[PDB]
């Protein structure tokens, strides 16, 4: 099959391998206590968490002296989080390979430096969001991504996770962000193309997909990523990526079309614009 | 049973800025989608912009983006500012609610009764 | 913007009898994103039917919308005093969202 190597970044199941939605897909122990922990190997551009019984940004430092703090990290001296792209290069101007590493990579190794409550040896590394409006660094101290149940959440944290567009220019990072994520995770929507299977030496149709409508591309990417693998209902809930991770969303019947199975191939149809579920809700190439 | 009330001045003078603010109770105002609608007598009814409760707005650009939308989800109001107003934006102004978040539910099935503002010197 | 054109303008029917109210666009609407309302006077838009077809709730079975395209129809089975008012079609595909110039139906007596 030619298109190998160019649907590689799109066997989400294996360059991302955990939840997207909710991305809980390792566990860690930090001082004695285990805790579940985000260990997705791509960014999720566009993802968010939405505080629903609160006026707070979830990006917001963490209380300090409950609800006027968010899910960032606790201030620090020296400040650590939130820190700028020219603050973590000139942070770690010692180290040579911090001048190679992007954005997005920088900010997840930014915040794996993070000792988890003076743990020296704990496996735990607090996941971070990056913002490219302001190119700054946030550290989630709380790496829980929703707590949305009827039991006490019907009427008042209760967040959920979420594509916005307030989220647009965000990136959730896990500590496993992959250095190389520009050449083997999803990133941009394709223009003129569809995903489908390659079958005796065809790309064809994928064979079953739920169609929902969809005004743009946007709330496509968005129900893409609400149907998306999760590692929480609403080891036995660890997706590792199995989901339903792709759409294809036809631009003319504004319909959206997600599926389950890995695409295989491309298909050239200039009504169609292929998504996932990893890649940014609004960019295209 | 959520109810939507507009609130704002009767009389604006020209040139200057149209404020008006919609009381939600009775229900959310989250995963919804909050309109400013308004009526010219002469004309049909017209689609001033949107909100989404984080922050997110939709204006018609044939306003020529002097529309101004916000939400306070602490009061649960949400706000319209209209800028460099014009006796032509003399008319009755609504804030209507979405049926829901999806884009086929974007149909607008809560109203308020509506508030007139006059334009004039 | 899309534009949505009603006809006829003014209908005066006695209850019982059947108002067929029609919506043009100029351009074509995915059907899940048409609706039409009812306005009575001092009293703000009431809706009657969205998705083209799906009757709103409390709204009686006479209401009937169906359409495709750039054509659209909305049907009331047998007019009843209460049902006589101002309708409108909206269209919400693409933004600005707008709305027919309205029909109003009178009371025939």
């Known amino acids: 099959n030619p298109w190998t190597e160019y649907m590689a970044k799109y066997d989400i199941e294996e360059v991302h391998g955990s939840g997207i939605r909710v991305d809980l897909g390792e566990d860690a122990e930090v001082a004695g206590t285990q805790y579940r922990l985000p260990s997705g190997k791509c960014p999720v551009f566009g993802k968010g968490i939405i505080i629903e019984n609160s006026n707070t940004a979830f990006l917001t430092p963490v209380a300090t002296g409950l609800k006027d703090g968010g899910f960032a990290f606790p201030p620090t001296e020296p400040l650590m989080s939130p820190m700028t792209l020219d603050e973590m290069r000139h942070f770690y101007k010692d180290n040579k390979y911090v001048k190679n590493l992007d954005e997005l990579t920088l900010c997840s190794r930014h915040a794996g430096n993070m000792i988890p409550d003076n743990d020296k040896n704990s496996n735990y590394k607090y996941p971070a969001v990056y913002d490219d409006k302001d190119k700054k660094c946030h550290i989630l101290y709380i790496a829980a991504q929703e707590n949305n149940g009827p039991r006490y959440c019907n009427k008042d944290f209760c967040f959920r996770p979420a594509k916005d567009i307030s989220f647009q220019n965000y990136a959730y990072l896990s500590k496993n962000v992959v250095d190389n994520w520009e050449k083997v995770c999803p990133r941009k929507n394709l223009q003129n193309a569809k995903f489908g299977l390659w079958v005796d030496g065809n790309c064809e149709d994928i064979p079953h997909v739920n169609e929902f409508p969809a005004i743009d591309l946007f709330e496509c990417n968005k129900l893409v990523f609400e149907l998306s693998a999760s590692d929480q209902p609403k080891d036995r809930y660890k997706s590792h990526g199995k989901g339903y991770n792709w759409g294809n969303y036809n631009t003319e019947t504004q319909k959206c079309e997600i599926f389950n199975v890995k695409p295989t191939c491309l298909i050239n149809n200039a009504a169609y614009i292929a998504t996932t579920a990893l890649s940014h809700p609004i960019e295209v190439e | 049973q959520v109810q939507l009330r507009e609130s704002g001045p009767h009389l604006v003078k020209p040139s200057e800025t149209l404020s008006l603010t919609c009381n939600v109770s009775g229900g959310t105002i989250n995963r919804y989608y909050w309109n400013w609608i308004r009526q010219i007598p002469g004309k049909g009814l017209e689609w001033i912009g949107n909100?989404?409760?984080?922050?997110?707005?939709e204006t018609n650009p044939s306003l020529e983006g002097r529309p101004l939308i916000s939400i306070d989800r602490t009061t649960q109001q949400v706000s319209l500012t209209l800028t460099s107003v014009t006796p032509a934006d003399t008319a009755v102004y609504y804030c209507?609610?979405?049926?829901?978040?999806?884009?086929?539910?974007?149909?607008?099935?809560?109203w308020g009764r509506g508030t007139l503002v006059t334009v004039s010197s | 913007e899309i534009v949505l054109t009603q006809s006829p303008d003014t209908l005066s029917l006695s209850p019982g009898d059947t108002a067929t109210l029609s919506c043009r666009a100029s351009q074509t609407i995915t059907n899940a994103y048409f609706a039409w309302y009812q306005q009575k006077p001092g009293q703000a838009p009431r809706l009657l039917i969205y998705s083209t077809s799906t009757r709103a709730s409390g709204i009686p079975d006479r209401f009937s919308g169906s359409g495709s395209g750039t054509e659209f129809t909305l049907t009331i089975s047998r007019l009843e005093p209460e049902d006589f008012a101002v309708f409108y079609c909206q269209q919400y595909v693409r933004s600005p969202w707008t709305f027919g110039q309205g029909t109003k139906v009178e009371l025939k007596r």
């Open positions: 209507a609610r979405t049926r829901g978040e999806w884009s086929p539910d974007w149909c607008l099935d809560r």
């Open positions: 909100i989404y409760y984080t922050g997110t707005t």
